[PDB]
Design a protein around this ligand. Structure first.
Ligand SMILES: CCc1c(C)[nH]n(-c2nnn[nH]2)c1=O
Length: 358
């Protein structure tokens, strides 16, 4: 790597790893389009397996960016529209509260207070129907944003219905394969188990537990190399040769709602660059609370803004991930760790690195 990149990354990440007691970490910096990789520590402490460029990490909620793009691709294919009522694709959802709740609301956490998590008690698909039928919105559709797995999770499941593909088959065939993400998985195959890092929570080795709508909301596992390629793809969608996928990426970065300084896309979240680091790290957008926030509709949605800080944080019980990029600068970062450590620390490190290189 160029010495500037080497220096900025190591001087930022080394103290981070120390301060946060992170067992293993992989970092990719995309600079002028090209990827540079950095690894530290352990994928498996007990078996003394190092983190490599081939190590799989649980992305947690960074998975929502894949779901958002897959949904965008389905829009481009003419299979779904974000203006469609939810009931068009799940007509068994007959309870009145669903009148006026569209696929847009589901994708953008604006349905009226769908809960953060699907209850673990929800095990079957009749359990799932009951859950959504019985849910009572706190607010009218399109008035408040409440970050929710049960919201975008449902969007993902419904978005693939017309295709007749399972969510996993659709994601594999329409997103992973075309982008040559050959080591990115919703379900880790036995062949790849040697590469699957353990997460660490309170000193224990843990992997994500199965749950309803897990694939759609938090279920993807990936390598630092594939995640670098994912960032590249989202930085420059015009290089993508599959028409609907190029267009799906663009739709995922459209600005649908505004809360404070943040704009809600499909999976991706955006702020205008230059960004004041404070907001994302400290004020209202730092993600330590669970926050209900009134939204302003962007009517119509603003197409992908090049001068944006586009990002997504992600966690599982044992993993902490972060992705951020600035399209106008051809600049990006991926940080994958096998410990769930505070979001503000992620954002700070990412800003510190990207700011120095921009
Ligand atoms: C997205 C909600 C969630 C988090 C943050 N962790 N987690 C989990 N970890 N292991 N099994 N489930 C979850 O299901």
């Amino acid at each position: 790597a160029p010495q500037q990149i080497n220096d900025i990354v190591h001087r930022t990440i080394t103290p981070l790893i120390e301060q946060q007691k992170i067992p293993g970490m992989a970092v990719a910096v995309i600079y002028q389009g090209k990827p540079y990789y950095f690894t530290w520590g352990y994928a498996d402490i007990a078996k003394k397996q190092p983190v490599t460029q081939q190590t799989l990490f649980e992305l947690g909620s960074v998975s929502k960016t894949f779901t958002g793009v897959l949904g965008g691709d389905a829009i481009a294919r003419g299979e779904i529209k974000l203006s469609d009522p939810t009931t068009k694709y799940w007509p068994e959802l007959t309870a009145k509260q669903w009148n006026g709740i569209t696929l847009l609301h589901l994708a953008t956490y604006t349905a009226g207070g769908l809960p953060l998590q699907v209850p673990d008690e929800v095990k079957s698909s009749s359990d799932l129907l009951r859950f959504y039928q019985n849910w009572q919105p706190a607010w009218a559709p399109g008035t408040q944003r409440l970050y929710a797995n049960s919201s975008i999770g449902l969007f993902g499941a419904l978005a693939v219905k017309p295709s007749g593909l399972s969510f996993e088959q659709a994601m594999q065939t329409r997103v992973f394969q075309p982008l040559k993400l050959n080591h990115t998985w919703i379900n880790v195959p036995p062949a790849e188990e040697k590469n699957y890092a353990w997460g660490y929570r309170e000193g224990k080795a843990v992997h994500v537990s199965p749950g309803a709508l897990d694939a759609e909301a938090y279920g993807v596992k990936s390598t630092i190399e594939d995640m670098a390629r994912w960032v590249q793809s989202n930085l420059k969608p015009l290089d993508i040769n599959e028409k609907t996928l190029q267009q799906g990426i663009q739709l995922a970065q459209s600005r649908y709602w505004q809360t404070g300084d943040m704009y809600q896309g499909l999976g991706w979240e955006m702020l205008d660059w230059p960004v004041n680091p404070d907001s994302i790290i400290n004020g209202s957008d730092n993600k330590i609370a669970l926050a209900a926030r009134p939204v302003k509709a962007i009517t119509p949605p603003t197409p992908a803004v090049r001068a944006s800080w586009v990002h997504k944080t992600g966690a599982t019980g044992g993993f902490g991930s972060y992705v951020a990029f600035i399209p106008e600068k051809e600049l990006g970062i991926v940080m994958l760790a096998n410990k769930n450590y505070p979001n503000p620390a992620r954002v700070d490190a990412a800003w510190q690195i990207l700011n120095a290189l921009q």
